[PDB]
Design a binder for these strands. Sequence first.
RNA 1: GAACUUGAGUGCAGAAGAGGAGAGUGGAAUUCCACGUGUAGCGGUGAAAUGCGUAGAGAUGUGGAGGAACACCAGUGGCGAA
Length: 115
Amino acid sequence: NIESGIAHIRSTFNNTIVTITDTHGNAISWSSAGALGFRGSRKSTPFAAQMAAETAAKGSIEHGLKTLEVTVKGPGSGREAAIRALQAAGLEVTAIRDVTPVPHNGCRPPKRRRV
RNA sequence: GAACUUGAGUGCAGAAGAGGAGAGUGGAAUUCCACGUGUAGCGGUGAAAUGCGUAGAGAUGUGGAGGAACACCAGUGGCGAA
């Protein structure tokens, strides 16, 4: 029953993560995009981000979690709503991380969709 | 045939440059493998499904292997005959 923990913001066009883990990155409860029986486009809404974040928060409160250190890693779709949901309990976002390649074209990305 | 120095070279003194060839080296990210935590989805689309997941995926942490390309700098900026 651990006091402190982490969550991990990493946002794209329509993908975001924020799982509830311990200080050393051992998991406890998890939040990332959906998880909650939502499907399709509803899954990527800001609303559905809240309900995923609440459900992982209320999972971790039962493990005696009081505070959540969260990261920063660019803007995206439903990142702000996911934080608002977590501020039911209350917490901080101190760290700032990144998912970027130090080469433009480190690995070659997949081809542009013709739509 | 004789001159000349404006062309064209040489000498001398500076300058900038992703010009080229060779050898070595670095960090970020992806992938795979191993392991810890954890558990039911993940992923994807206009909407789906095939896929991948309880033989424990996805997420998260740590380490290992390997290849390729070089964020920011970076600019009708530079260099090059192209």
